[PDB]
Amino acid sequence: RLTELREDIDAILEDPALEGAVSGVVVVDTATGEELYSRDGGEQLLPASNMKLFTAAAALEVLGADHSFGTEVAAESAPGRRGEVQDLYLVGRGDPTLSAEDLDAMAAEVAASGVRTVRGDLYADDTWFDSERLVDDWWPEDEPYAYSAQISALTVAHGERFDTGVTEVSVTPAAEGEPADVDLGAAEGYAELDNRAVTGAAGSANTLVIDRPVGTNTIAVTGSLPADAAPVTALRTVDEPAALAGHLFEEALESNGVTVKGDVGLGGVPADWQDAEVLADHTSAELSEILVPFMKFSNNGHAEMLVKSIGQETAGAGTWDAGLVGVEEALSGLGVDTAGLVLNDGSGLSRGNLVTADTVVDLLGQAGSAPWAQTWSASLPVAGESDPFVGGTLANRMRGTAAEGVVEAKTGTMSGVSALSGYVPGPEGELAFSIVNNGHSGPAPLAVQDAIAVRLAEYAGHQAPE
């Protein structure tokens, strides 16, 4: 095809959805190196979550595909005869998957290694990273939601998708007139609850709202929920994620016969502790396994944690500023030319980011030529696949088309921003593309993205199913 394929994409790209918008669309054969389509490939645009590609590759570079994260528990000395200690520390070192059950097993160890009592205070130590909890230009009004999760070294991850810094809020109706039962889940007895919610008559106005008023650690429920309606689970953030982890760990300890007589709160392992006793430790799966629930579902926590991890590796500075310089650096070292990159964050959430479709495709190029390449591939959503962990953010797109089970792309979405970028493998060769829609006045031009994606899939020796 080539110029015929060009014509096909030229046709797609006029669509009345893309009215008033800029679009970096770039296609390259991995093998031939040749450029197969270009348009505004050098234009600066916000990537939203496509930023994640840059973060993922950097992290792979700087930490290696087999890097593992640690949590541990420490006291100044071994427990004393009746099984006692003074202060006690739960210490995060950036594990983006540390779970309530992981906490449990660590508690069980503290018991197993002799401790009957924490006769002083328990600290949640998250100082491996700085404590700047949110990016300069993140929007305040987003904060209660999961994707705006606070960023902290010590952070508990909820459910199999390892969403950090949240709690699940359960809202279950009673009967018409009667109020509704609200659970804060993991955050119970950590965050405040202000339940003004009320079950309404069956099949009526659903007007429920689960909020955390800016600057507070209070879950505000308000509005109505119909009696016949199904129970609403809902993911919501909390302030100081390490304090929550502290609280959960108190719960864990007491639940393993370890009494905690003092306060729970934030604290760093003191410098005057030269022979600290590591009573318990946990180790996350290596970075390879972590990239999946990260990239599949586009997890902001993980991204921004890895930036601060890149920060700690290259500079010993668990900080966006260093993490970010260590991102630019990593990439330059990968062959990627970063002239057009503007880094504000690692997830894409920052409006302050900028990219170009060549900078993307460049990166895609350099990535498939890598010791890690394979694990990089394993992270990206694969179109039209039911199983959330295969489909990721593309599970419900390009179904029953050439691209289904073929195209390896990464999504990026925001009020005025869309993006699709990855690999089109197949019989007639591998292929690499970037489509970065920006400023479109309506809904995210997903039809265009998908229509182009299928085009390439056919171009690779695939057929639409029947």
Ligand SMILES: *[B-](O)(O)[C@@H](C)NC(=O)c1ccccc1Cc1ccccc1
């Ligand atoms: B990325 O997936 O573009 C990511 C940075 N976007 C968000 O986290 C985001 C921004 C604004 C509103 C909602 C969300 C969540 C989201 C949006 C699309 C796909 C996945 C998650």
Ligand SMILES: [Co+2]
């Ligand atoms: Co509790």
Ligand SMILES: [Co+2]
């Ligand atoms: Co096929």
